[PDB]
Symmetry: D2
Subunit: 283 residues, 4 copies
């Protein structure tokens, strides 16, 4: 039921330790967002009580996201993926999060060199069924983020994400789209939204170069008009890679700055997105 505008906290914190959480919440207040997305690079280390109290005091909602580490890629090590996800689901639920989303079906860097196979998808479906039931037991939902061909060869489009949701058969898994990935993957950016429309509950609003929304190659008018047209009432989450911790950035093929500074990205990008949301009547 995540609604309104939010921010992926990577711009201030990929390490969700005590000072990092305080720093991200502080930013969230400064930009008057409705929610934050909390990356969980190391779920066991998260202080759930601190974060809960922070979200409650500051009347902020949250969800969490991750991508599977290689020791636990679901396509090939599903039992370890289930174990990794159960820990992340519990931490998410305990800190007050409403969903765990992201690359929860695999990891950044998976690539076999040939098309995804039924054996791989079978393993993913088994992992997501296990994890969805655990999520349900803690009262949260799972999100599946479609990412571009280079990061993962399994779920790149909204239509692929929907197929996996159908193969799993749960009711608490939604699609999570990201405009930067859709800019590469969708045959017309609106088609990712169209194909996912029955399951789309969250979208990363990111520019085509991970810099400043409004200043790249994404078709924002098409994106926003199509979200309004399908009655999108889910989470509008700004994602930019500015000020990413270096080794995490290098993991995402950031070889060079995506933008001048946080003042360019947040000062120009959030108003652009909020303005478009008002323009097309998502508010």
């Amino acid at each position: 039921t995540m609604q309104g505008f939010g921010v992926h906290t990577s711009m201030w914190t990929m390490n969700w330790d005590r000072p990092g959480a305080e720093r991200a919440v502080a930013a969230a207040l400064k930009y008057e967002v409705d929610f934050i997305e909390i990356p969980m690079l190391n779920p066991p280390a998260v202080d759930t009580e601190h974060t809960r109290a922070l979200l409650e005091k500051n009347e902020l909602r949250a969800l969490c996201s991750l991508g599977l580490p290689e020791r636990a890629w679901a396509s090939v090590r599903p039992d370890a993926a289930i174990e990794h996800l159960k820990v992340a689901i519990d931490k998410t639920a305990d800190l007050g999060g409403e969903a765990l989303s992201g690359v929860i079906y695999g990891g950044i860097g998976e690539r076999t060199g040939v098309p995804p196979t039924e054996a791989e998808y079978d393993n993913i479906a088994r992992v997501l069924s296990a994890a969805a039931k655990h999520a349900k037991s803690r009262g949260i939902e799972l999100g599946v983020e479609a990412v571009n061909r280079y990061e993962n060869h399994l779920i790149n489009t909204g239509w692929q994400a929907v197929q996996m949701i159908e193969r799993v058969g749960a009711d608490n898994i939604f699609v999570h789209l990201d405009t930067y990935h859709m800019n590469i993957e969708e045959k017309g950016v609106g088609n990712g939204i169209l194909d996912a429309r029955e399951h789309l509950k969250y979208i990363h609003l990111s520019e085509s170069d991970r810099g400043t929304p409004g200043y790249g190659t994404c078709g924002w008018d098409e994106i926003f008009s199509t979200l309004a047209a399908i009655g999108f009432k889910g989470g509008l989450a700004m994602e930019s890679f500015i000020n990413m911790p270096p080794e995490v950035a290098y993991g995402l093929a950031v070889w060079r700055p995506v933008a001048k500074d946080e003042e360019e990205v947040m000062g120009n990008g959030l108003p652009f997105l909020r303005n478009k949301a008002k323009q097309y009547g998502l508010i």
Copy 2:
């Protein structure tokens, strides 16, 4: 009006719907393999309804008709004459096998007071459209209200204004008719016209921003088609270009120079572009 698929406004071959003109237009429709034609009715009384009916039926073609009111019958100021004009056009549309009368049926090209539209004007329009809608209902057809840009008419320029008139009238057989060329000027983001009209949108003119070749101008086609798909549009996708319009009609529409090279450019590049986009975004 259940009109569906692709069609063409026949102005590229005929603005005078006489006997050879109707045959010329139907011949074009077959060549480009469209599902329906839009028949301009510049002079409704002169239309041979039986000839056109037979032609549509024999060739498996659907149709609607469209018009703008002449000044002697602008509805905002001369509603009684507007009603009389529309009744004749509605009867001719139904009798030729048409499923709707659409267009600038609420006023005319060239209305302008210099100030915002007034409630008195809208009251006269609503009375005309209510009378016309009743008459259309009795003949089994629907009416369409085409939003046009600020310079052609000062009364209905956006999808949201068109929906407000439909609500003011309260009929069930009036729909909205959008035109990408007018939306390109009037809508605050072109998809917003579709969004605002979504509960009433049954027909759209796919026209380029300069009235030339769709795909080669300033209209935002991906937003247009994505948004049509996203609202589940299943109405008429009608191509409109001003290529080869008769001069007098063209001058009345502010065509001061060619909109395109020739029909081969317009139909040969523009129709495939639009069919391709329709398939791309799943309207097909």
Copy 3:
């Protein structure tokens, strides 16, 4: 002229260029840190040039003027009346410190014969603009010819037509003025107007497709800004949004409903957008 940087057509802030309106406009221009304002020259005898000049120099603002000709002086058909009107307008522009007189200086906003333009009309215009260009030269200012859409004028609608008139007149102090709202209607791909006009282009109205807030309509801004960067554009970038409507051109401009909530929404959201695009595409001066 040498106009560079960002400016605003003063309809953003006032309906007429009277003394209180000039006060209100210059004060608003200062809270946005623009480099110049564009002042309508619709009632030349009514402009208090000493008052305006003092305001401009005090607040270190540059200016130019624009107009459309009234029907009594449409150059198409009443060229001698047009020469006289333009001479008065030029003098007032020069007097108040403005650096150019631009816009629809060749005809009316809302001018239309009902038929395509003729050589007789273009010949009259050329004669008027030659005479007007000599008088501008005598007062130290330039003239601009703005292409406007088919519904506002039937004579010059595209960058290519504007350049053809500039080359027909053969003056050296007349430049082309484009407007993205008009190009959105007239140009077969918006960048083509910029390309066609590139050798004479010194000024552009960055106006949204519905005269509203730039960034929130149907104009193709990335194409516009990339093409302006590519041709080396170095002239004025001016906003034009009819928050207020000068009465003498209201009928031709056809703003029958609000273009935007208010001046704060257009300047607060549109100017940053435009400045940010100019910097994104590396526009000379940024």
Copy 4:
């Protein structure tokens, strides 16, 4: 001097073997393009005089493209890279090709895990200088194609490619842009064209998902307006991986069909692109 429209032959054949050359040249003539772009991925395996005969016979021009294999990535193994490029240059010359372009400076799929270093660019520059001399020896030019961050970590933007061209100092190396790559890397697609304007001689007009141009997220009006604005006069080349050369498949990451078939891409994409070139008055159209 490549002018007009051409097609990268992955449109029609996976490998440039003898039957693939015959099938690609036949299709190229059916669509009346001016040139084809031939992958030079296994130089020893190319039958040059067979291809040369086909090209001359069918009044077709050609250039070659490649990415370097890991054994000869210029950034880490510069001497192997020089040797490999000389072999590829000689074969491109022998078959009548007029340039060797693409990722001639590195691998399709090359990544260290960290940003590029000066040591890497120093090696590439040395490689390209030597390669440029030998290309001149055989009378062809070299092209440097910027590719997106996921295929190479070294040259990703028009401005980076120009910086390497200025560093090497050679007269006969041009910049090669790709709209699919610029869709990801350029901060506004036209900026890649603007940044590379002094050296830009070749452009891949490739849709954002490698499918049919005109049916993705590439900003074609911006692309074509800016090309006209800078006076682009070089080659306009389609690139759609209907067929996937085996040696670069892992790096190009085409895991599902980019389009129905080569008829859909050529039948819809090429007229779209020819029509835009005419619309914006591109020199040669």
